[PDB]
């Protein structure tokens, strides 16, 4: 049974723009995708989830994820100046203009409730909303408020499922699942 390479998978599976933004995120952190390739895949996956989440409701969200860090903070600080939002301690992923809050999107291969609790412990915010997806359909969100409707979230979950089945098909899932954290 053949075992594919994760780089081949990422470049074949993810949109060119997503791959390029992921390369940029890794460079900005000085990470080498040729060595940390499971991480490369996880970054692309996280980017794509953030984009799908925003696209579920045109106009509602500002995207923070994907931007260079300096531009990301520029955008965050502008949103805070404009809307009166409290400045987050860590860069979030989106800003929700309807619910008036920043959102941290988590995508995990670990148990979603534990991942959620860890995220919540890290950001130290009474305000930032957290929404966690797993690759097998489970999710967890702040105050049991899932923000988007069932169809939109199903679209995201189906995508995560497809990625996982594609990986497994190439023998890449075992390592990807086990490599997190
Ligand atoms: Mn982020
Ligand atoms: Mn995130």
UniProtKB/Swiss-Prot annotation:
UniProt binding sites for Mn(2+) 1: 46, 93, 104-105
Record keywords, A-Z: Cap snatching, Endonuclease, Eukaryotic host gene expression shutoff by virus, Eukaryotic host transcription shutoff by virus, Host cytoplasm, Host gene expression shutoff by virus, Host nucleus, Host-virus interaction, Hydrolase, Inhibition of host RNA polymerase II by virus, Manganese, Metal-binding, Nuclease, Phosphoprotein
Lineage: superkingdom: Viruses
Name by which UniProt lists this protein: Polymerase acidic protein
Compartments it resides in: Host cytoplasm; Host nucleus
Keyword Zinc: no
The organism of origin for this protein: Influenza A virus (strain A/Puerto Rico/8/1934 H1N1)
Residue span of motif Nuclear localization signal 1 (NLS1): 109-124
Role, per record: Plays an essential role in viral RNA transcription and replication by forming the heterotrimeric polymerase complex together with PB1 and PB2 subunits. The complex transcribes viral mRNAs by using a unique mechanism called cap-snatching. It consists in the hijacking and cleavage of host capped pre-mRNAs. These short capped RNAs are then used as primers for viral mRNAs. The PB2 subunit is responsible for the binding of the 5' cap of cellular pre-mRNAs which are subsequently cleaved after 10-13 nucleotides by the PA subunit that carries the endonuclease activity.
